Scaffold this active site. Structure first.
Site, PDB file in Angstrom:
ATOM      1  N   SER C 201      33.290   3.274  23.952  1.00 16.56           N
ATOM      2  CA  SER C 201      31.867   3.324  24.270  1.00 16.56           C
ATOM      3  C   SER C 201      31.623   3.980  25.621  1.00 16.56           C
ATOM      4  O   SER C 201      32.025   5.122  25.844  1.00 16.56           O
ATOM      5  CB  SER C 201      31.287   1.903  24.265  1.00 16.56           C
ATOM      6  N   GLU C 334      28.808   2.908  13.465  1.00 16.77           N
ATOM      7  CA  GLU C 334      28.686   2.625  14.891  1.00 16.77           C
ATOM      8  C   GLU C 334      27.497   1.731  15.236  1.00 16.77           C
ATOM      9  O   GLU C 334      27.660   0.663  15.865  1.00 16.77           O
ATOM     10  CB  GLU C 334      28.608   3.928  15.696  1.00 16.77           C
ATOM     11  N   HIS C 447      30.864  -0.713  15.851  1.00 16.42           N
ATOM     12  CA  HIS C 447      31.199  -0.365  17.223  1.00 16.42           C
ATOM     13  C   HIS C 447      32.227  -1.327  17.817  1.00 16.42           C
ATOM     14  O   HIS C 447      32.006  -2.530  17.882  1.00 16.42           O
ATOM     15  CB  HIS C 447      29.929  -0.399  18.071  1.00 16.42           C
TER      16      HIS C 447
END
Ligand SMILES: CC(=O)N[C@H]1[C@H]([C@H](O)[C@H](O)CO)O[C@@](O)(C(=O)O)C[C@@H]1O
Ligand SMILES: CC(=O)N[C@H]1[C@H]([C@H](O)[C@H](O)CO)O[C@@](O)(C(=O)O)C[C@@H]1O
Ligand SMILES: CC(=O)N[C@H]1[C@H]([C@H](O)[C@H](O)CO)O[C@@](O)(C(=O)O)C[C@@H]1O
Ligand SMILES: *[C@@H]1O[C@H](CO)[C@@H](O)[C@H](O)[C@H]1NC(C)=O
Ligand SMILES: *[C@@H]1O[C@H](CO)[C@@H](O)[C@H](O)[C@H]1NC(C)=O
Ligand SMILES: *[C@H]1O[C@H](CO)[C@@H](O)[C@H](O)[C@H]1NC(C)=O
Lengths: 532, 532, 532
Positions: C201, C334, C447
């Protein structure tokens, strides 16, 4: 077009083009260029540090804040000295070490114009730079006009006497700017080899100061002091300042154990915490009731052993030093209306008598610094001339001015002359039209008045007669010329006698003609009364 | 005449002249000479930084403030130790890094007299330099006396155990002063080649600490520890010292997330806030109930890795380091009255029994550090004699006087001799007539009682009997003599044998003479009981 | 046996051996090694300065403080990513510049294992390096694992757009840490010559920034950006940043007269005060009411002129630079949960039609940055397929996922390859059994779901199916394999095609096999819309 982008040592600056009426090539104006690291926190009451460089293009196109001061006084003064159309509203902040450049050069191709750094006045207590616009003086005389700023009041002059805060930070900031000019003014089409510093009032004093200073050496080549010099007591403090330092300290709420702690504590204070003190301390105002000798006039220039190793009344006796052309002038009526109106001088009655006067002159100690045992012989020689009372007030004003600027200015003139260097002097005797509706019309050539002419106000503000337009346009040429060769003279201008043994000067105004012995008779009179 | 003005590396110093019965030459006294930049602001909890040079003539004519500390506790200790007729009150400030100088040399002539830099005592928590007037010592023995002040308490010895605040800020300042003497004393008629350091109590310890420190090497050529050494555990923190820090922070109202956050947060606190915190920890006073271990003892020297690279114990094992004459002495009744009187010791009935003595001794762990299971063994060797409650109260005291100064001193003195360097021990046995009224007339050789025969109190205070005058003149001779040649001996002085293999020492008192194996018995014993 | 004792540049550090069930070679673990001095006080909003050397043996046995951030959120994140047994409670502190080491080397000898510096993500607002345990990885693939920290939120990214505070403090840290790596990792069995940085990230975007940063050059030889690259708009602030600064300053109660002033003012505030402001701004949360454009989502990366001389969009266009094996990767879904949840998205209905989605993509302006005239075109392209308001949601989600991680990550790969450099891609498609009991079982590869595989969670926690355990191994070997020779391929592992012109990538999950053209139609379409 494309905004003008000059490359400097610390980075690329960006200004705005401003075309003036009657010219081709517009003038590139830069507002807010930093010349020293913002004096915040641990940097309060210390010499200015070099400013950090920037990574891109700094859009210096807005008026920088004015150093912290009395907002109402500062706005007032800014309204009486400005030369531009409408006055500009400014903000206060500790971060004010900036300056402005008005170059009428053609940046595209190398140029090397004379520079004229302007040190604004304002008793070292108030004032700003943006107030003065060079646009007119720039284009009309092809000179790069630079206006600088320096810390005022406590921020710039608080001193504990010892070394934990020698003082004169304000004056060190002016020197710091001048250094910036020497290292950058070139990229602005100006010539670092021909800088001319000129000021009015406090700024006028600051000039004379930097002149006698070993630090200011090689930073300028010509100087001009308008209404005010270094021998002007009121702005230069002599003797043990500790008491004054302590008096400010307590007022802020700071132990006074040792100077070290004192200074330390003030650093713990905020801007408002120091602005309120500057207010409570009531500076720039004559305190009626109370022993005159105690009344604190203002924090100002001191002897720190750095910027000024000795007093001014000392350095003028020595010849072994660096000398440069020096123009020093005064005005017909310095104490006409401005100052009095500001410091709220007790004259609302109308006229004055031999008795009442003696009192004021005395209570005016923080200004003229006259011994009580002198007041008598003093008022007599001046006001005692006629039984008329309506003339006593006037002679009283003409008196108060001759002590602050009159004699002083001339005394600085003679010595500079004697020191073996070019010296000139003038006497502005004109009444501007841009004045206030509240100023009496009987007062001609008041304080600072000459500025409008000098800064070509006739060309910005409207309602100016052709007479005044031609006058202003004239004084700029003299000023500009002086900046160029160090001799005001030129073609199409009256002859200005070099202030030498003949002691001749120039009476600028309606009829701009030469004259001799300025206040001579007066100087002599005080050269004895002030020696007991 | 004209006030003494000497030129130092940092600027001019203005002193004042003072005369003394029996000497024509007036002694020059300088008060408040700054040997470091005021450890203020972020400078808190950090090494001593060099002072900033003054631009004119600094008036070193006032009594410098004492580092922040228990205003009462500190004022009281000063009244007691002082050697002047009238004690001088003192102001508290963080800005306290100053030193006083007394030169009996004619400053208008080259003079290189031996220097005696005095470090006052006061458990590293209190005390000051202005307390001890050097006037007498100087005149009488023709030497320059320098009393210095170093940082105390939190300000001086607050340690986090790591690089964010090593500690010993105070010891640094001490060395910081030595470096000042080495680069300046030459101007006050002092020989920077014969600097002798001597302290008493807490000052006696630190003087030992400099002897083991690398940072102090080459800053002094003679040392003297009066009633205090490095092995005097109490004034030397051992083991993890982090906990103390956390408990000091918590009390002061600080966070304790990490060491850094900790130090940083204290720097933010104010002198008033740390002064109030100093009075909350209750550092000098001896607690009564509760467990002795939990009892907070005090701050103090610590193994930082700069001043001391390892405990004084280990260090004393290596002789590979440079060595200098050392004079270590104690007092007959160290714990006679002075210390307890302040620590408010449980002595009042004028008699102590066996069972209680063990209970009390234990409640004095922060002063002796003895396991409660051992107390019985000790309390027997000392109090096992006569069965008289009075002779006990007196014996229990001679007990503490041995575990504090006696044994620790001799071991330090013995280890120095073993190193191969001149050593000399002494035991003071005299009760000055300058003591209080609340002091039993049966205590000969109380804590600090030598301080009256060392600083020539008999020549500053009144009454002094000839015997007490002859004593003082004799110590000052030995002391100065030691300072000069590193040997206390000289003309008209009893013989003072070197603490060599025969272990000889001097018994200074009304009738002074040499002896042998001082406290050799108790040492041997205490070294054993500590077997565990 | 005895704790590991490594000697670093600034001093010795002590760690603790911890063996992983099965491996005979115990892993040396160190926690809380400072790689910079603590950015407290005046060092706030300035570049990280080298750490101060210590004098003894620093015990690195406690988890360092995570930089200041929202305490609740900071925990929440640490709980949904951690791969260790029991979550670890953390403290907040400005002093957080530390890194953790997990060397599997036999420190007694001289090993030069490959080093993997992991940069944790969290939106540059919340996070912590102590969250990620490297005992598994370091053990299983024989590599030195490092977990560095870096200032966050205001503390690490507050920029004013001028020299007074350029910004990117957090990135400048990640760098300083990498530096510490090159000058120290050697004593921990690592090879400073084969360093590999990787992060998920925001962590990933940091990788993409270092690779594109000239300063970062030579501080690493392999890179892995997991779910996040420098082309992830939300994380990089383009345009004028001054507005956001005047917004923060004002929220923290500060004057905005000048940038020099805003900073100085924010430096005074207590860390808690600023944290308040951090909670007042409401970052990491979707502003449902107001203006999607004026709603600043979170301060972050900027074009300072020190770390980034230009937008990453203008950087990739220049092949004239240093290239290193890069592995960019994205997960199947995601924006499938972890993000929509933390930001509190209004999708609690589990469905939504077009007129709602079109309005959602608008308010989501701070993430997608899609104009109000493109909404229809983009909405009709992703949702115009079916009518099932429930499946139009999974497409709206997949929509936001493609503009933030999908397309961008690919464009970055395409540009690295096309710049001449080993490039690799992958799409993780697995749902770990360590997921929150609040995440639907239908959301696969959300994610951060890869983390549990990359850090080998299936070996520190319980409940790992035989399948996952295997997956976790394979990915780990792939990773270490890429750290060893910039090539994920090895023995016994599915073939991973280099991302060349065929655009071949690897799909990781239950069944692992390569594929071609990842998000081809996606990057196409989207580049068309943004073309304006
Ligand atoms: C904050 C503000 O609006 N003022 C301007 C300042 C000025 O330099 C100073 O205020 C002095 O003019 O900084 C800029 O010039 C700049 O660096 O790009 C742009 C900015 O607009
Ligand atoms: C407390 C202190 O140290 N500062 C004092 C200094 C000292 O001269 C120098 O410090 C050297 O002692 O100046 C005074 O003494 C003075 O006469 O004006 C007052 C001031 O408080
Ligand atoms: C110095 C400090 O206060 N922090 C902690 C450190 C950490 O490793 C990091 O340095 C900071 O958290 O660990 C200690 O045990 C240590 O011996 O250094 C002390 C303390 O617990
Ligand atoms: C320092 O002492 C001298 C006395 O010799 C005195 O003249 C002077 O005023 C003192 N310093 C100040 C400025 O107070
Ligand atoms: C430092 O760690 C070692 C590890 O055994 C331990 O012996 C020592 O007590 C620790 N120091 C501290 C902080 O107490
Ligand atoms: C600053 O001014 C320039 C010149 O007009 C302009 O192009 C730029 O966008 C402005 N940006 C800033 C720093 O405000």
């Amino acid at each position: 077009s494309s905004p003008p982008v000059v490359d400097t040592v610390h980075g690329k600056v960006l200004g705005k083009f401003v075309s003036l009426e009657g010219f081709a090539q517009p003038v590139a104006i830069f507002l807010g260029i930093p010349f020293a690291k913002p004096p915040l926190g641990p940097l309060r009451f210390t010499p200015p540090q070099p400013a950090e460089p920037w990574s891109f293009v700094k859009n210096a196109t807005s008026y920088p804040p004015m150093c912290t001061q009395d907002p109402k006084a500062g706005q007032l003064l800014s309204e009486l000295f400005t030369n531009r159309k409408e006055n500009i509203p400014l903000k206060l902040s500790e971060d004010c070490l900036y300056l402005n450049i008005y170059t009428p050069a053609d940046l595209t191709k190398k140029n090397r114009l004379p520079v004229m750094v302007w040190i604004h006045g304002g008793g070292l207590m108030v004032g700003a730079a943006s107030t003065y616009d060079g646009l007119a003086l720039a284009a009309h005389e092809n000179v790069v006009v630079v206006t600088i700023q320096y810390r005022l009041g406590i921020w710039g002059f608080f001193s504990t006497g010892d070394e934990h805060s020698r003082g004169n930070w304000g004056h060190l900031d002016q020197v710091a700017a001048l250094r910036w000019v020497q290292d950058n003014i070139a990229s602005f089409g100006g010539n670092p080899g021909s800088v001319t510093i000129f000021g009015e009032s406090a700024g006028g004093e600051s000039v004379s100061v930097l002149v006698l200073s070993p630090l200011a050496k090689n930073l300028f080549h010509r100087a001009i002091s308008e209404s005010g010099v270094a021998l002007t007591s009121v702005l230069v403090k002599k003797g043990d300042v500790k008491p004054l330092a302590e008096q400010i300290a307590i007022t802020a709420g700071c132990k006074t154990t040792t100077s070290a702690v004192m200074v330390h504590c003030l650093r713990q204070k905020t801007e408002e915490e120091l602005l309120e003190t500057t207010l409570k301390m009531k500076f720039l105002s004559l305190d009626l009731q109370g022993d005159p000798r105690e009344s604190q006039p203002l924090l100002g220039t001191v002897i720190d052993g750095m910027l000024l190793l000795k007093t001014p009344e000392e350095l003028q006796a020595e010849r072994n030093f660096h000398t440069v052309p020096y123009m020093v002038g005064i005005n017909k009526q310095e104490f006409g209306w401005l100052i009095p109106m500001l410091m709220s001088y007790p004259l609302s009655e109308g006229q004055l008598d031999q008795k009442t006067a003696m009192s004021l002159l005395w209570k005016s100690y923080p200004l003229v610094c006259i011994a009580k045992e002198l007041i008598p012989e003093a008022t007599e020689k001046y006001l005692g001339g006629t039984d008329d009372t309506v003339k006593k007030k006037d002679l009283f004003l003409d008196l108060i001015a001759d002590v602050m600027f009159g004699v002083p200015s001339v005394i600085v003139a003679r010595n500079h002359r004697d020191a073996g260097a070019p010296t000139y002097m003038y006497e502005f005797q004109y009444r501007p039209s841009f004045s206030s509706d509240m100023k009496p019309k009987t007062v001609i050539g008041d304080h600072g008045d000459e500025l409008f002419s000098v800064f070509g106000a006739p060309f910005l503000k409207e309602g100016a007669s052709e007479e005044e337009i031609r006058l202003s346009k004239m004084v700029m040429k003299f000023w500009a010329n002086f900046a160029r060769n160090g001799n005001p003279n030129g073609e199409g201008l009256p002859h200005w006698p070099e202030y030498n043994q003949k002691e001749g000067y120039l009476q600028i105004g309606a009829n701009t003609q030469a004259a001799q012995k300025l206040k001579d008779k007066e100087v002599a009179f005080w050269t004895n009364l002030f020696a007991k």
